[PDB]
Amino acid sequence: KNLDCWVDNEEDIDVILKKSTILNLDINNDIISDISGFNSSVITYPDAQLVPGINGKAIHLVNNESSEVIVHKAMDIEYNDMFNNFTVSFWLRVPKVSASHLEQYGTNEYSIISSMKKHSLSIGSGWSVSLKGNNLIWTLKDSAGEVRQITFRDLPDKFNAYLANKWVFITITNDRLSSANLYINGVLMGSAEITGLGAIREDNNITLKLDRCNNNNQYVSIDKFRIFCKALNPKEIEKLYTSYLSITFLRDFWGNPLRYDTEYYLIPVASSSKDVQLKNITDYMYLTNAPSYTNGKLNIYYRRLYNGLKFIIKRYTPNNEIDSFVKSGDFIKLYVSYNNNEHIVGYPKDGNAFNNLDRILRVGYNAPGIPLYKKMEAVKLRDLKTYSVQLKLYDDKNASLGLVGTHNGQIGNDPNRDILIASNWYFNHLKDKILGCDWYFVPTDEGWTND
Ligand SMILES: CC(=O)N[C@H]1[C@H](O[C@@H]2[C@H](O[C@@]3(C(=O)O)C[C@H](O)[C@@H](NC(C)=O)[C@H]([C@H](O)[C@@H](CO)O[C@]4(C(=O)O)C[C@H](O)[C@@H](NC(C)=O)[C@H]([C@H](O)[C@H](O)CO)O4)O3)[C@@H](O)[C@H](O[C@H]3[C@H](O)[C@@H](O)[C@H](OCC[Si](C)(C)C)O[C@@H]3CO)O[C@@H]2CO)O[C@H](CO)[C@H](O)[C@@H]1O[C@@H]1O[C@H](CO)[C@H](O)[C@H](O[C@]2(C(=O)O)C[C@H](O)[C@@H](NC(C)=O)[C@H]([C@H](O)[C@H](O)CO)O2)[C@H]1O
């Protein structure tokens, strides 16, 4: 803590994050402003775009020189990082680079955030955040012209990868008396020795914009951009990361808010390589293997997306109000979209159920006279870091029919399958690290396109 900023009380992480923050980009009524107490100024150019963020709206940048945000560092923070420790933390969302783009822009490195005066592949001093292929780069440069750099390679499985259009949380801490550490989602991804460079003298503006990017199509989103005047520690990091994740909103596979009337494919967290298939209208659902995509020469692979059943969420009692956002604790009707029709998902009174308890879900059941329970509550009962949802079924008396999940079993002469069910069993295993009632809601997205 020798080169850290504040000098008061080294115990309360919550209070430490606040007191040590020196720049803080928040967005309110469509304006980006600094919300640390320093009131640095931010100038939002004309083509800076706002999109859903992990908690309110975020900044979306596209590839024209008029899509940018500038921060004019205030008087009393202007120089902080010339010698002291600083930490930069932000949420990022980069689209899965298409294999074509990996071929033709894979050696093109460009910035998205930078404190460092630029000129025709010649650089000032300061730092930048840059992308080159599927690499995320941190980069410190000092008055003498000396550089320190971290290069984090994204894993080759894009379903899991940090640079494949999911929101991820970046934090970079630089302790001038030791290292620069690169974290993603609270984990240490990369690091380098920064002992030895002196005097980081940079631009008086922090700049948000794509810089020297060859692909006319790139975009990226940045939220909650923040500068602390210290190398935060991982226990500080963990707390900073989870603080952004308030349960009150459910999220889609990408980290964006869960909405009604929109098509999502279901993929189970515990079985991420499966899609949902349906036996027949009126019948059960089961897990089947999704088709996968590999490419050797590019070192990349993913299970493909956009097949299996699409579902749609609707409010139980719906009509007049304005929130298209599914709140955890909301009661919904779940439907399957198959040829323009909406077939509600439910469990009919007395439908088979393994063992009398794991109730086999049914798509489109219509047996006259037979009650069909379809009131669901979508909830976030665990695993906050994972953008996943749980779904609870009720019968028509407000008794619980269980969380939605699967159960291996056999039905008639179809083969062994993992059939979708509703069961109260899950409710005793809620601390498990992996659970079978955990769902990803996946909407089509510009950022992910199967090649
Ligand atoms: C199906 C099941 O195992 N559990 C369902 C549960 O059923 C019970 C019952 O057994 C009980 C029990 O759990 O309730 C009670 C029983 O007294 C004890 N045994 C003793 C004396 O302790 C067993 C025991 O604890 C079981 C665990 O359940 O463990 C052993 C075992 O001793 O038998 C442990 C052993 O190491 C295992 N061996 C091996 C090599 O793995 C075995 C073995 O796996 C099992 O024997 C078979 O899998 O388990 O627990 C049932 O035994 C009972 O069965 C009925 C039977 O179904 C029925 O046919 C029979 O009727 C018949 C006679 Si006749 C056909 C000749 C006419 O009647 C008997 C008795 O009634 O049913 C009980 C009903 O209550 O019931 C609940 C309902 O709420 C659930 O169905 C349980 O299943 C879970 O369902 C979830 C979704 O609904 C998931 O699918 C779970 O699956 C995952 C998961 O966690 O989601 C799926 C994962 O892929 C899987 N991964 C891995 C790595 O395994 C996991 C994993 O299996 C477990 O999480 C633990 O690792 O499950 C379902 O598990």
Domains of the chain: 1-245 (2.60.120.200), 246-451 (2.80.10.50)
Within 10 A of 47 (CB to CB), how many other CB atoms are there? 15
Ligand 1 site, residue 355, Cβ cutoff 6 A:
yes
Residues facing 129 on adjacent strands: 113, 138
Complete DSSP assignment for 43-98: EE-TT-EEEEETTEEEEEEESSTT--EEEE--GGGTTGGGTS-EEEEEEEE-PPPP
CA of 179 to the centre of ligand 1 (A): 50
∠ CA(155), CA(159), CA(163), 5° rounding? 55
CA of 403 to the centre of ligand 1 (A): 17
Ligand 1 site, residue 420, Cβ cutoff 6 A:
no
Ligand 1 site, residue 403, Cβ cutoff 6 A:
no
Q: Classify each residue of 409-435 as buried b or exposed e, where b means 16 or more C-beta atoms within 10 Å of its C-beta.
A: bebeeeeebbbbbbbbbbeeeeeeeeb
Q: In angstroms, how far is CA 157 from the centroid of its own chain?
A: 16
> Which tokens in the block code for residue 207?
């700049």
Ligand 1 site, residue 354, Cβ cutoff 6 A:
yes
CA distance 166 to 168: 6
Length in residues, the chain: 451
CA distance 295 to 16: 46
CA distance 361 to 373: 10
∠ CA(352), CA(432), CA(325), 5° rounding? 75
> Which among 150, 28, 158 is positioned nearest to 88, based on CA atoms?
150
The answer to whether the CB of 13 falls within 8 A of the CB of 239 is: yes
DSSP secondary structure code for residue 242 in this structure: H
> Which among 256, 217, 220, 38 is positioned nearest to 129, based on CA atoms?
220
> Which among 169, 172, 139, 135 is positioned nearest to 155, based on CA atoms?
135
CA distance 396 to 393: 10
Top mutation candidate among 285, 355, 418 for ligand 1, by most atoms within 8 Å of CB? 355
The answer to whether the CB of 217 falls within 8 A of the CB of 449 is: no
The position carrying tokens 């302790």 is: 175
CA of 425 to the centre of ligand 1 (A): 11
The alpha carbons of the chain give a radius of gyration, in whole angstroms, of 24
CA of 418 to the centre of ligand 1 (A): 14
CA distance 17 to 451: 42
Ligand 1 site, residue 422, Cβ cutoff 6 A:
no
Closest atom of ligand 1 to 429 CA is 95
Tell me the three state secondary structure of residue 351: coil
**How do 285-289 and 292-295 pair as beta strands?**
unpaired
**How do 362-363 and 330-337 pair as beta strands?**
unpaired
> Which tokens in the block code for residue 79?
């120089």
The answer to whether the CB of 40 falls within 8 A of the CB of 72 is: yes
Ligand 1 site, residue 421, Cβ cutoff 6 A:
yes
CA distance 329 to 331: 7
Ligand 1 site, residue 410, Cβ cutoff 6 A:
no
Measured over the CA atoms of residue 287, residue 291, residue 296 and residue 299, the dihedral's sign is negative
* Residue 71, Ramachandran bin (φ over 0: left; ψ between -120 and 50: alpha; else beta): beta
Residue nearest to ligand 1 atom 61, measured at CA: 355
Ligand 1 site, residue 418, Cβ cutoff 6 A:
no
Q: For the chain, percent helix, then strand, then coil, each to nearest 5?
A: 10, 45, 45
Tell me the three state secondary structure of residue 117: coil
Tell me the three state secondary structure of residue 313: strand
Top mutation candidate among 269, 407, 434, 439 for ligand 1, by most atoms within 8 Å of CB? 407
> Which tokens in the block code for residue 192?
């380098």
CA dihedral 288, 338, 157, 435 (to 10 degrees): -60
DSSP secondary structure code for residue 182 in this structure: E
Ligand 1 site, residue 271, Cβ cutoff 6 A:
no
Residue nearest to ligand 1 atom 59, measured at CA: 355
Residue nearest to ligand 1 atom 71, measured at CA: 355
Ligand 1 site, residue 405, Cβ cutoff 6 A:
yes
> Which tokens in the block code for residue 60?
């979306």
Residue nearest to ligand 1 atom 68, measured at CA: 355
CA of 90 to the centre of ligand 1 (A): 45
CA distance 336 to 11: 51
DSSP secondary structure code for residue 254 in this structure: T
The answer to whether the CB of 140 falls within 8 A of the CB of 159 is: no
CA of 396 to the centre of ligand 1 (A): 29
Residue nearest to ligand 1 atom 12, measured at CA: 425
The answer to whether the CB of 419 falls within 8 A of the CB of 286 is: yes
Closest atom of ligand 1 to 437 CA is 96
Ligand 1 site, residue 358, Cβ cutoff 6 A:
yes
Closest atom of ligand 1 to 423 CA is 88
Tell me the three state secondary structure of residue 370: coil
CA of 440 to the centre of ligand 1 (A): 26
Spell out the long-range contacts of 138-145 with Cβ–Cβ below 8 A and sequence spacing 24 or more: 138/172, 138/180, 138/182, 138/190, 140/174, 140/180, 140/194, 140/197, 140/200, 141/116, 141/197, 141/200, 142/197, 142/198, 142/199, 142/200, 142/201, 143/198, 143/199, 143/200, 143/201, 144/197, 144/198, 144/199
Ligand 1 site, residue 70, Cβ cutoff 6 A:
no
H/E run at residue 331: strand 330-337
- Is 321 buried (19+), middle (13-18) or exposed (0-12) by CB count in 10 A? exposed
> Which among 441, 199, 442 is positioned nearest to 328, based on CA atoms?
441
The answer to whether the CB of 294 falls within 8 A of the CB of 379 is: no
* Residue 423, Ramachandran bin (φ over 0: left; ψ between -120 and 50: alpha; else beta): beta
- Is 162 buried (19+), middle (13-18) or exposed (0-12) by CB count in 10 A? buried
> Which among 64, 42, 22, 100 is positioned nearest to 295, based on CA atoms?
100
Residue type at 442 in one-letter notation:
V
> Which tokens in the block code for residue 325?
């956002």
Ligand 1 site, residue 450, Cβ cutoff 6 A:
no
Residue type at 303 in one-letter notation:
R
CA of 386 to the centre of ligand 1 (A): 27
Spell out the long-range contacts of 312-317 with Cβ–Cβ below 8 A and sequence spacing 24 or more: 312/260, 312/261, 312/262, 312/263, 312/264, 312/336, 312/337, 312/342, 313/258, 313/259, 313/260, 313/261, 313/262, 313/264, 313/378, 314/260, 314/261, 315/260, 316/375
